[PDB]
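Recall from the previous chapter that SMILES is a line notation for molecules. Here it describes E7K.
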Amino acid sequence: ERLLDELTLEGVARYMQSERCRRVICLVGAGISTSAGIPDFRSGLYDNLEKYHLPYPEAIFEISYFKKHPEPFFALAKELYPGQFKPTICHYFMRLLKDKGLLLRCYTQNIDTLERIAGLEQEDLVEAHGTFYTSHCVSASCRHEYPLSWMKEKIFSEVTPKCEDCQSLVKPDIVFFGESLPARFFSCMQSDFLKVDLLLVMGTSLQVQPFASLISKAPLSTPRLLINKEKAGQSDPFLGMIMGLGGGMDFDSKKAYRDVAWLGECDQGCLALAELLGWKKELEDLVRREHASIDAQS
Amino acid sequence: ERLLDELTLEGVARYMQSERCRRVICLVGAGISTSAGIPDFRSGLYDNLEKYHLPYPEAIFEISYFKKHPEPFFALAKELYPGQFKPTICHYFMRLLKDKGLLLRCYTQNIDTLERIAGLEQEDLVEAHGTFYTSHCVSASCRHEYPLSWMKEKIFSEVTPKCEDCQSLVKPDIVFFGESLPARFFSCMQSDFLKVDLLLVMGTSLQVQPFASLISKAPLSTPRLLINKEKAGQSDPFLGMGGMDFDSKKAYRDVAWLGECDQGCLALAELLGWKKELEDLVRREHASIDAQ
Ligand SMILES: Cc1cn(-c2ccc3c(c2)CN(c2ncc(Cc4ccc(-n5cccn5)cc4)s2)CC3)c(C)n1
Ligand SMILES: Cc1cn(-c2ccc3c(c2)CN(c2ncc(Cc4ccc(-n5cccn5)cc4)s2)CC3)c(C)n1
Ligand SMILES: [Zn+2]
Ligand SMILES: [Zn+2]
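With both inputs in hand, we obtain:
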């Protein structure tokens, strides 16, 4: 017998306010930051790198190429460095989940730091594709850590960032091609996916790793709500880690029992869910107060 | 245990010609059909999907959507239907493996039928992502089978293919999102990987199931040759899901050959003494295809 009374946003809200739902995991991608003006750094932003004649377009995000020729990456980083950092209604919805004791973890494939600006703490977060929040000297014997303020000053001054201690390259803690996913992802995912009562999957197409396969690590009974412009994750039998196990999203089949798709902008979906839960005024008041503070320090 | 004398194409060829190597498994993907003009149906084909008013781009390959609205799929099938079916050097290299009693199985993730055109038979093949070669009525109680010539005529005439028995939808035997991997795959994979002496992995980045799994099903002693345009796990960690070891101090059984699958197979054919047979086979088969 399935846990949701019906496969609708209304059924998820009732489940969230039941004793059965204590621990929520959020999986978030580029779709939660587009309303904050953060480009989807995956899906034409290369068309001002003429002077660099890259050997292939993706070389700019490949660790071995970066370490030999870091200048293209830092030129692009200046061009695309966000003009302001104003988290969205969706980011503040996750802050409410934390305040209400429901947030087990926010897994993010975003690098923009908006989860932290919205008030999620390191312990609440798994930055599965890394983050601009910190940067490190690349020299194995040194690994000196630098804050974003330091990296920003290097980016805007068009000075290739070098370590103060050893003068090696300093790289933002974002995952390049040819690097591993962060240690923190592997640690947290083996424990969190045992304890999860609800997966809230927002603003991700579920095409890139780890989220494309990670959805299949949830217990088969755990309800999953996708808030996104379109249905995503119906990828079986191609992307599940276990052959013959059907862990991909199923909104549409005869056997659908636990997956709900709410189609629209992540902000409007989060407002809709907040409204059902009786949290709409709290969420709007939170966004008003936080946005007002960000504008004031402008 | 090290079955290769050396981690080179020359060491693999010597091993293949030795009594120890009787049973070769090929894992082949989109990289073996690109030189034949077959698009990689996975990896800008999302651009002209706009015109179908799909609820999400992948709906065109999803079984529940297909059964309700088959017209977009069959319209794209007309657009992307190959203009010619000329198997590659790599396809004909696997035909030589069959003829010379070395081929245990060709596992393909390709749907283009070029393995069959090259002369691999059903018994030689596991079409792990299915195939356009046959189509079936989708009604559980009917399942009338249709050949590609029948499906092609429906696709080009822009007539939704309907069963001549029951008028249900007729679907190509390709794996849509929402379907199982083929019965044939589950049967063969549990037996073949006990008997395999050599894995020949060609034109696949091992990014999706079942190849992501199959790569590690061989005995730990079984040598593995990768012939591929790009290094194993190039787009790691964003598109990859044991794993192959060409280069570490512990490397003992994995060989990489980086380049076009055709050029890799010609190189290996050279060391086997099969190059003239292979070129003559391609010439004679392509000549016959052009004549018809
Ligand atoms: C399947 C696949 C994966 N990838 C892939 C892999 C690695 C990376 C990318 C994409 C894209 N990357 C970037 N893009 C633009 C960048 C400039 C930038 C972004 C943010 C900030 N920022 C400062 C403070 C807050 N945010 C400043 C500058 S960094 C990060 C590496 C591709 C291309 N396809
Ligand atoms: C992880 C993942 C999986 N997938 C995925 C899943 C299912 C399918 C696809 C891709 C691609 N599909 C297709 N592509 C083009 C097609 C037109 C076409 C192709 C061949 C011929 N042909 C006639 C004779 C010989 N070949 C005629 C028309 S059918 C088949 C279903 C994605 C997108 N990501
Ligand atoms: Zn240093
Ligand atoms: Zn029928």
